[PDB]
Amino acid sequence: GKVALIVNADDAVGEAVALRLAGSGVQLALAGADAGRLDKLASQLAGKGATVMAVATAAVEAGAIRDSVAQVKARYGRIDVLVHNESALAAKPLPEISDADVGAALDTGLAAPFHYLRAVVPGMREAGFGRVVNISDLRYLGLANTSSVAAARSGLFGLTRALALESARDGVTVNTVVMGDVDSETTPAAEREKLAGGIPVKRLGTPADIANAVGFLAADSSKYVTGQTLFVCGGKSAYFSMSI
Amino acid sequence: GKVALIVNADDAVGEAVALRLAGSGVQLALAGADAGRLDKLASQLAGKGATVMAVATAAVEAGAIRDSVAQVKARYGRIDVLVHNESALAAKPLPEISDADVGAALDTGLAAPFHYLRAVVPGMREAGFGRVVNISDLRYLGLANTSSVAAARSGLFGLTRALALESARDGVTVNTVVMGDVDSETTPAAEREKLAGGIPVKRLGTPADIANAVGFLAADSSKYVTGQTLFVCGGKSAYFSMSI
Amino acid sequence: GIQNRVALITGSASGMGKQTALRFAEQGAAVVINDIDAEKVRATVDEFSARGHRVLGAVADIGNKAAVDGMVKQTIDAFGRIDILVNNAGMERAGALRKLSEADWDVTINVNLKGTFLCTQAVHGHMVENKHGRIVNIASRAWLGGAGQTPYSSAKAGVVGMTRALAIELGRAGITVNCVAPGLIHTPMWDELPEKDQQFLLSRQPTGKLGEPDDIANTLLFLADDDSGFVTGQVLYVCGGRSLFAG
Amino acid sequence: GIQNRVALITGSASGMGKQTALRFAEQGAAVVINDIDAEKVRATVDEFSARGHRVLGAVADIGNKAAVDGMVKQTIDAFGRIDILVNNAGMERAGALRKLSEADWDVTINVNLKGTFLCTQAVHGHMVENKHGRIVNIASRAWLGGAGQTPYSSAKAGVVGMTRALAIELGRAGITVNCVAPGLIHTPMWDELPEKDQQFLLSRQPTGKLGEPDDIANTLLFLADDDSGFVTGQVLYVCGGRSLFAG
Numbered sequence: 010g011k012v013a014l015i016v017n018a019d020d021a022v023g024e025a026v027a028l029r030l031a032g033s034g035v036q037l038a039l040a041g042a043d044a045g046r047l048d049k050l051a052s053q054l055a056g057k058g059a060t061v062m063a064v065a066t067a068a069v070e071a072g073a074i075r076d077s078v079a080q081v082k083a084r085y086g087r088i089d090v091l092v093h094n095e096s097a098l099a100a101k102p103l104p105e106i107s108d109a110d111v112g113a114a115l116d117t118g119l120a121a122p123f124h125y126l127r128a129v130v131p132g133m134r135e136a137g138f139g140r141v142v143n144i145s146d147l148r149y150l151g152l153a154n155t156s157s158v159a160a161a162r163s164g165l166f167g168l169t170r171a172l173a174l175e176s177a178r179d180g181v182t183v184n185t186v187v188m189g190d191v192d193s194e195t196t197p198a199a200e201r202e203k204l205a206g207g208i209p210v211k212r213l214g215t216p217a218d219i220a221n222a223v224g225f226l227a228a229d230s231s232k233y234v235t236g237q238t239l240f241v242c243g244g245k246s247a248y249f250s251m252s253i
Numbered sequence: 254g255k256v257a258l259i260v261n262a263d264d265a266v267g268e269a270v271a272l273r274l275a276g277s278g279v280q281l282a283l284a285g286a287d288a289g290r291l292d293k294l295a296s297q298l299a300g301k302g303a304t305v306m307a308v309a310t311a312a313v314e315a316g317a318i319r320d321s322v323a324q325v326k327a328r329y330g331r332i333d334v335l336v337h338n339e340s341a342l343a344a345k346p347l348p349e350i351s352d353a354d355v356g357a358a359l360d361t362g363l364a365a366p367f368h369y370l371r372a373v374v375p376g377m378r379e380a381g382f383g384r385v386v387n388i389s390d391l392r393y394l395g396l397a398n399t400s401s402v403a404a405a406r407s408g409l410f411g412l413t414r415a416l417a418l419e420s421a422r423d424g425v426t427v428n429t430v431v432m433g434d435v436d437s438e439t440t441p442a443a444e445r446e447k448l449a450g451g452i453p454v455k456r457l458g459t460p461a462d463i464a465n466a467v468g469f470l471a472a473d474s475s476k477y478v479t480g481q482t483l484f485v486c487g488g489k490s491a492y493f494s495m496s497i
Numbered sequence: 498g499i500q501n502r503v504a505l506i507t508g509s510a511s512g513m514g515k516q517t518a519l520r521f522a523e524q525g526a527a528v529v530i531n532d533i534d535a536e537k538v539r540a541t542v543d544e545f546s547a548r549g550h551r552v553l554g555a556v557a558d559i560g561n562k563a564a565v566d567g568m569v570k571q572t573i574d575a576f577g578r579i580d581i582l583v584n585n586a587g588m589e590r591a592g593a594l595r596k597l598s599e600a601d602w603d604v605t606i607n608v609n610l611k612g613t614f615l616c617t618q619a620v621h622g623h624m625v626e627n628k629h630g631r632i633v634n635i636a637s638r639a640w641l642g643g644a645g646q647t648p649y650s651s652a653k654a655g656v657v658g659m660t661r662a663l664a665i666e667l668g669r670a671g672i673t674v675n676c677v678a679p680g681l682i683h684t685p686m687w688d689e690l691p692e693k694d695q696q697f698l699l700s701r702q703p704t705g706k707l708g709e710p711d712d713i714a715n716t717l718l719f720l721a722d723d724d725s726g727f728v729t730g731q732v733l734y735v736c737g738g739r740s741l742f743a744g
Numbered sequence: 745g746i747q748n749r750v751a752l753i754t755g756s757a758s759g760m761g762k763q764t765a766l767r768f769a770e771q772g773a774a775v776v777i778n779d780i781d782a783e784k785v786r787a788t789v790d791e792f793s794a795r796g797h798r799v800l801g802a803v804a805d806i807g808n809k810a811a812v813d814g815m816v817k818q819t820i821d822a823f824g825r826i827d828i829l830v831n832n833a834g835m836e837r838a839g840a841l842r843k844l845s846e847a848d849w850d851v852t853i854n855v856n857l858k859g860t861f862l863c864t865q866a867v868h869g870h871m872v873e874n875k876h877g878r879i880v881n882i883a884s885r886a887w888l889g890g891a892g893q894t895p896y897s898s899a900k901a902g903v904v905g906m907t908r909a910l911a912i913e914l915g916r917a918g919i920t921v922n923c924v925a926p927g928l929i930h931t932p933m934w935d936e937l938p939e940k941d942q943q944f945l946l947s948r949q950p951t952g953k954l955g956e957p958d959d960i961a962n963t964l965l966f967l968a969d970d971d972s973g974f975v976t977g978q979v980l981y982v983c984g985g986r987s988l989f990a991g
């Protein structure tokens with residue numbers, strides 16, 4: 010009888026997270042931009058026996074986010090688990106980055122999750138239990154031709170750790186799962202062998218890999234794990250300075 | 254390596270940076286919001302024999318920033334060194350964080366330095382020489398009651414490293430000096446005595462400490478040091494996970 | 498899960514290592530109890546089998562290569578494979594720099610760093626043949642640096658570098674190599690303290706509470722799981738947030 | 745600056761250590777040339793004295809405690825103080841995990857990690873007396889993990905933990921403890937290689953160029969400077985960006 014909100018549930022990673030938590034008896038709320046995709050996902054999850062609601066939203070403004078949050082809490086009466094799946098961001102060389110490219114990356118990549126945390130974290134501290142899992146990716150560490158993505162994702166590192174310390178005393182944990190290279194079935198086969206060669210386990214990651222890590226951090230027993238940046242990357246994070 | 258722009262030069266750290274760089278013969282451009290303070294600083298530096306110009310500007314919008322940069326390039330014909338000193342940000346507990354507190358922190362703490370880097374890095378890569386030094390502080394790692402500051406500062410980590418890699422081939426380096434606790438002569442002696450005890454070297458940092466590290470990264474000979482997060486903290490950064 | 502995987506846990510005759518073995522066995526694993534204290538091995542082996550668990554005692558000094566090879570051979574004779582290795586055996590000689598004997602350094606390095614190297618080396622070839630392995634090393638928040646802990650911080654920091662190196666090297670063979678860095682954990686020592694001390698340390702814990710041995714066992718269960726094959730090269734703190742700022 | 749400071753650079757009779765000693769002497773420091781190679785010690789001491797530098801040869805296996813103490817005694821008898829210690833002496837035996845001999849491990853650990861511990865210990869009491877010290881340890885990008893480099897990655901990662909631990913402990917005595925992690929550096933090995941070797945590694949460099957020993961010497965001059973007393977506990981990469989992604 011635990012309740013979880015999955016933001017940006019409308020992709021393969023969101024689907025896998027929803028399936029892992031449903032498997033553990035968690036009551037689900039799915040937020041996302043593609044209502045069509047959300048309804049189909051909820052339909053499949055309900056079909057398997059999960060308690061689930063959907064909420065369409067392509068928002069980055071705080072008020073709209075706080076409302077979405079209100080819908081969920083109206084239905085379930087509390088949010089024990091918040092999983093923020095990242096929204097797609099386009100990485101481009103510096104010259105191709107416009108004034109609006111900067112603002113948009115920050116809005117969806119950093120501001121939007123911040124707003125979700127502000128709308129949910131206070132409730133969790135009041136109830137004395139909370140599990141926040143931010144899903145980021147390796148570009149937060151900074152790579153060539155990703156500056157606009159890296160600036161936004163990198164903000165979640167200090168953000169998550171700040172609120173982890175602020176909420177620790179009230180039974181809340183805030184952690185980050187950092188995705189490596191995940192297969193998607195739209196990448197060219199030549200880019201699968203190319204990417205896999207550069208990964209120590211010599212295979213691309215799956216959405217299930219990510220959900221397994223999210224499910225661990227969201228588990229009731231992970232009460233002493235907080236502030237963590239857990240890479241699910243096949244070892245590729247070992248090539249970066251400052252990933253530990 | 255003769256021309257340097259110091260953004261937010263109108264504080265004690267900016268002054269110290271200006272003195273160190275002028276001491277090495279660098280021609281200076283000082284940007285900041287407090288024209289009164291900026292002019293007094295330029296006056297003192299000229300009085301000692303330094304080549305200096307001032308540019309008043311409290312801007313965080315990209316277009317205004319590019320203008321500021323153009324003024325400098327009009328006067329000197331090139332920017333070999335960019336030092337972005339951080340602007341003051343209000344750290345506050347999550348409940349006291351408003352919707353606009355979030356946007357402002359990102360705009361002044363993260364978007365603004367990004368815009369400066371976008372305006373200067375292309376020039377540096379074209380000239381084949383560049384030294385970018387971002388000045389941040391320990392709140393980027395995340396502490397209780399700093400979430401809006403941590404989110405903004407933390408974005409500079411991936412941003413600097415992304416552009417370090419993107420520009421490396423063209424003689425440009427992008428590094429970060431992370432300030433620990435700096436004495437200010439408006440801090441109470443009672444908060445100095447408390448703070449110093451928590452620092453391994455048992456003293457507060459001075460603006461000169463910060464400028465010394467900035468001067469090292471900006472030197473012509475630091476051509477093989479890039480992407481670095483150099484703490485100038487008296488050892489306090491050794492208490493944080495993920496600072497190395 | 499880890500049903501019917503074979504797990505060798507070094508230094509598991511008492512303390513957190515002991516409790517990780519119990520939880521592993523409860524989740525369906527065959528566990529090898531190792532320690533240098535042969536009486537604690539026997540008592541714990543006795544305890545575990547009594548509970549119905551598939552367990553083998555293997556007394557061996559993890560700092561001695563021949564003893565490690567004999568341990569692994571005994572494990573292979575018994576269970577035919579080693580799916581999971583937890584390098585939990587550790588110790589510390591501490592003191593101000595000038596007060597550290599050459600022996601204070603040599604032993605802390607030998608048990609924590611070399612010992613973890615010896616067991617990982619001796620076991621990994623078996624995981625290579627089975628195209629499956631989970632190697633988890635127990636480091637410490639003190640790898641980030643601790644006053645008066647030069648040898649322990651050096652040794653455990655070395656374990657972190659080994660974790661990263663072998664995560665890169667062994668990945669192609671289906672072996673993951675991860676590290677758990679425990680913060681402050683309720684230990685028998687903890688009860689040996691006066692309230693005034695205790696209440697100082699807790700107050701430096703963000704949660705205000707102590708970690709328990711189960712906190713490590715559960716994190717270790719996650720890293721060892723069949724489902725966690727894409728997690729490798731990681732340093733996961735089990736510290737209640739103290740690792741975020743330990744000043 | 746470092747005018748009138750006394751600097752001990754271990755393993756400085758050849759390679760970048762020598763180039764660090766030269767630049768230190770040129771910036772006003774008295775330098776102790778150390779190596780295990782007594783003939784390389786004499787040749788460099790001779791070379792430096794001819795250049796007008798204040799230099800002393802101190803032959804010692806920095807991995808042997810007795811030899812280290814004699815080096816420190818020879819330095820103190822000669823110059824009366826030790827202001828700067830650069831733990832540059834290092835080495836590596838590498839190979840697949842299964843092919844690493846116990847001796848390949850023991851020596852890499854002994855020279856890089858214990859040696860750095862022995863020299864830092866033997867020197868620090870003198871810096872405490874003077875309420876001023878600069879300790880800089882030479883680690884490597886490989887502390888982040890390198891396939892086939894289990895011993896080297898373990899040792900240099902251990903040097904990172906030692907740097908952090910001692911920065912915390914020794915700071916109150918006016919001693920800073922920092923670490924430099926060189927990436928790829930133009931070396932005599934490099935000049936003695938065939939072309940195809942060279943062109944792969946360069947291709948992995950963000951700058952497209954190799955680092956030079958002066959890059960290390962200049963970075964070390966900064967950390968050792970009288971003005972850098974508030975810099976401690978740091979790991980500063982001299983890699984040309986390679987450390988940001990080495991895959």
Ligand SMILES: NC(=O)c1ccc[n+]([C@@H]2O[C@H](COP(=O)([O-])OP(=O)(O)OC[C@H]3O[C@@H](n4cnc5c(N)ncnc54)[C@H](O)[C@@H]3O)[C@@H](O)[C@H]2O)c1
Pocket residue numbers: 507508509510511512513514531532533534557558559560561584585586587588608612635636637638678679680681682683684
């Ligand atoms: N709160 C904590 O206790 C804490 C905190 C941080 C890290 N750690 C680390 O977690 C691990 C377990 O913690 P612990 O408190 O149970 O330590 P512990 O010393 O109480 O138990 C470790 C066991 O390993 C045995 N052992 C087996 N082979 C050995 C060998 N060659 N040399 C020496 N001992 C050998 C020891 O006899 C001992 O019983 C250790 O590595 C420790 O460094 C513990």
Ligand SMILES: NC(=O)c1ccc[n+]([C@@H]2O[C@H](COP(=O)([O-])OP(=O)(O)OC[C@H]3O[C@@H](n4cnc5c(N)ncnc54)[C@H](O)[C@@H]3O)[C@@H](O)[C@H]2O)c1
Pocket residue numbers: 754755756757758759760761778779780781804805806807831832833834835855859882883884885925926927928929930931
């Ligand atoms: N590209 C690189 O060369 C590179 C990269 C990363 C790290 N490093 C590290 O930089 C340091 C020096 O670099 P290097 O290229 O000159 O390596 P190197 O093989 O030339 O060793 C430097 C000196 O140390 C001496 N030495 C070895 N063992 C000694 C001992 N026990 N006692 C005293 N002296 C000893 C050697 O005589 C040698 O002259 C090493 O610690 C190395 O690990 C080098």
